[PDB]
Each structure stands twice: as C-alpha cells, then as structure tokens.
Amino acid sequence: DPDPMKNTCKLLVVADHRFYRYMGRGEESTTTNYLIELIDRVDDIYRNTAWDNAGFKGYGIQIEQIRILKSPQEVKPGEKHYNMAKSYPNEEKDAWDVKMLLEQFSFDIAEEASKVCLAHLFTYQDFDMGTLGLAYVGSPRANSHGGVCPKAYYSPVGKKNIYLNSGLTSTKNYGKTILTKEADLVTTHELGHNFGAEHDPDGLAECAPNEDQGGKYVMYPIAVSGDHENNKMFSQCSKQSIYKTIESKAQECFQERSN
Ligand SMILES: CC1(C)SCCN(S(=O)(=O)c2ccc(OCC#CCN)cc2)[C@H]1C(=O)NO
Ligand SMILES: [Zn+2]
Numbered sequence: 001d002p003d004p005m006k007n008t009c010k011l012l013v014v015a016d017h018r019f020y021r022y023m024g025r026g027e028e029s030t031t032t033n034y035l036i037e038l039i040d041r042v043d044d045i046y047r048n049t050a051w052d053n054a055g056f057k058g059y060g061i062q063i064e065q066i067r068i069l070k071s072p073q074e075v076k077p078g079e080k081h082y083n084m085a086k087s088y089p090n091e092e093k094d095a096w097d098v099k100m101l102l103e104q105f106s107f108d109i110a111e112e113a114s115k116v117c118l119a120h121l122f123t124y125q126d127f128d129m130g131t132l133g134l135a136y137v138g139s140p141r142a143n144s145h146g147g148v149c150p151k152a153y154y155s156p157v158g159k160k161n162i163y164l165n166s167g168l169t170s171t172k173n174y175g176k177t178i179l180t181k182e183a184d185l186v187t188t189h190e191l192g193h194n195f196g197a198e199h200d201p202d203g204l205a206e207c208a209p210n211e212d213q214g215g216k217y218v219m220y221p222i223a224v225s226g227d228h229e230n231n232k233m234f235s236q237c238s239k240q241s242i243y244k245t246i247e248s249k250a251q252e253c254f255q256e257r258s259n
Contacts, residue, residue, distance in 0.1 A: 002058050006254040009117035009148055009195075010064035013039065014109065016083045017072050018124035023171055024068075031068055035122060039063055041184050042191065049234055051243035059246055061191065062258060064116050082108045082121065095125035098168070102134045106166045107155075113163040114150050117253045118194050120187070121168040126175060132223060133186045135167025135193040140248035147194040148245060149253035167194050181226040188232065189218050196245030197238040207235035 015024065015031050024031025039061060047060035072085035080088055082105040088096050096104075105121050106113065113119045138147020145153050146164040155162045167190040171183050178186075199221040200207045208216055215228025217235035224231040234242065246254075 002056060003250060003254075004058075005256045006250045007059050008255050008257045009059075009061045009253070010255055011039065011061055012065050012067065012109070012112055012116045012119040013063050014067045014069065014105075014119065014121045016069045016121065016123050017085075019122045019171070020068055020070055022124040023122075023177070026070075028068055028070075032066055035066060036063065038183060038187060042187050045184075045188055045232055045234075046191075049239070051239050051246060053236075053239070056243065056246075058257075059250070059254070060257065061118070065112070067112075080104060087125065093128070095127045095170070095172075098127050098131050098134045102136075102166060102168050105168060106162060106164060107158055109166070110158075110160055110162050113165055114152070114161070116150065117148055117165065117255075118191070119163075119166045120191070121166070123168060123170045124172045125170055126172045127170060130173060130223065131170075132173055132178070132182075133167065133169045133190040135190040136164040137193045137198060138196040138245045138249065140196070140244045142248075142252075147196060148249045165194070167191060179226065182223075185218060185224060185226050185232060192219050192234065192238060192242070196241045197234070198241065200235050200237050204237070207237035 013035055020031050043060045047058055050057040069083050073081035073083040075081055075084045082101060087093050088100055109119055136146030145151055150163045150165050152161040169186045169190055171178050197219050200217055200219045202208055202221055209230055214230035216224050217230050217233055219238045
C-alpha cells in the first residue's frame with residue numbers, strides 16, 4: 001500500500017536567464033506561474049498513474065523551492081557556469097551540448113540539490129538534432145547515483161560532494177518555442193528517467209502501440225507530439241521500472257503531499 005506520508009517527490013525548480021527572458025517575458029511572476037502550472041499538470045499524470053495497475057497510485061511531484069535567474073552568470077576566462085550567456089563548448093551554436101549542461105548544472109547546483117528529491121533546470125536554447133531534455137535515470141538500488149533522492153558522491157576534481165538527482169527541459173526547438181503540451185511532455189519524460197524508466201523498446205507492440213491503438217507512450221525514444229492519447233501516459237515497460245524504484249526510494253526521500 002502507498003504511504004500517504006511518503007508519496008511526493010519535492011522539487012527544486014530553476015529557471016535560467018534564457019527561460020526568464022524568452023518564456024517568462026523577463027517577469028518573475030509570469031516565469032514563476034508558468035512553471036508552477038507546468039509542474040501541476042505533470043503532477044496530474046504521475047498522481048493518476050497506477051504503477052502496479054491496481055492501487056499503487058497517488059505518487060506525484062510538488063515544488064519545494066523555485067529559483068529564477070534574471071541575468072547570465074558573469075564568467076571569467078576559462079570559466080564556465082550553467083547560467084552563463086555563452087553556449088559551451090561551441091560558442092557559435094545557440095545551445096550547449098546537453099550532456100555537458102546537465103553535468104554543469106548538477107555541479108553548480110550541488111548544495112541545493114542535497115535537500116531535495118530532484119532538481120530540475122528549465123532553459124530556452126535550441127539543442128542539436130531536436131533534443132529537448134536530459135536526466136539521470138533513477139533506480140531501486142541504494143548505492144546508485146542518479147534520479148530520485150540525493151545520494152552524495154565525492155568528486156576529486158570538483159572538490160565537493162555531487163548529486164545526480166537532476167534533469168533538464170528546454171522549450172525551444174528548431175528555432176521556435178514548443179507547444180505548451182509539448183513542454184508538459186518533455187518534463188514528464190525527463191522526470192520519467194529520474195523515476196527509473198529507460199526509453200520504451202521501439203519494436204515492442206505493448207509498449208509502443210501503433211497509431212490506431214492510441215500511439216506511442218511518453219518514454220518513446222523519439223519525441224512524441226502529444227496529439228495521440230497514449231503520448232502523455234506511461235507504458236507497462238515504464239510502469240514496471242518506476243514501480244520498483246518508487247517502492248524502494250519513497251521511504252528514502254518522498255514526503256507528504258501538501259495542500
Ligand atoms: C538523450 C536523448 C537525445 S536520446 C533521444 C531522445 N531525446 S530527445 O529527442 O531530446 C526527447 C525525446 C522525447 C522527450 O519527451 C517527450 C516529448 C516531447 C515533445 N515533442 C524529450 C526529449 C533524449 C532523451 O532520451 N532524453 O531523455
Ligand atoms: Zn529520454
């Protein structure tokens with residue numbers, strides 16, 4: 001049975017200056033509200049999911065803390081930060097290499113990451129080949145690094161404890177803002193990774209249904225559009241992975257749903 005005291009993964013949500021400016025129109029209230037609403041809509045998907053196809057449901061996400069970054073992180077030569085104006089490594093391209101950004105983020109945000117189930121970055125940059133987000137995949141293993149629940153690993157190079165309870169979402173793609181319903185999907189998918197799911201096996205009928213059958217599920221390896229009914233749901237494949245991870249990890253860092 002679910003523990004009503006341990007059914008909610010509380011988030012740190014960060015908006016960088018690219019998100020603030022383009023998505024939030026350079027207004028704290030707009031940015032803040034957009035993200036509060038997005039997460040609440042992603043929460044409705046999670047909370048309503050029955051992970052064992054019976055009564056293991058009511059698991060969700062809520063914002064512990066939001067951080068809004070109004071202007072770029074001023075950076076010295078040879079220096080880098082996830083909120084810096086420059087795209088790393090190629091400063092000519094509009095966007096970072098996504099893996100490097102999540103790594104930079106996890107590194108820069110480490111102190112705050114330690115207090116939360118998950119940290120999520122929201123940005124506004126155009127990643128190569130239509131990439132929209134990235135996140136560490138969670139696991140039932142206590143020893144595991146990645147996904148739900150802060151687990152320190154010492155980094156000799158970074159001179160500190162790091163945490164891999166992190167993920168990112170971008171709302172820009174192919175030169176334009178993506179649909180609202182697409183943004184819900186990216187964050188659902190990336191948090192899906194955090195919660196223990198790998199990508200759906202692409203030839204498996206049950207976990208990758210044909211269009212007549214409702215279309216693909218949200219962990220499909222190629223971005224679903226949101227036009228089809230299955231697109232915002234989790235497959236049995238994802239359910240099984242996430243179920244195990246929640247079973248193990250809820251006790252560790254899940255909290256009570258707040259009003
Ligand atoms: C690391 C990856 C390049 S591997 C290939 C899939 N993507 S992605 O194209 O950026 C992507 C795909 C689907 C997503 O969510 C559903 C949606 C939508 C809106 N159309 C989000 C990102 C990344 C990946 O696996 N990230 O976890
Ligand atoms: Zn993915």
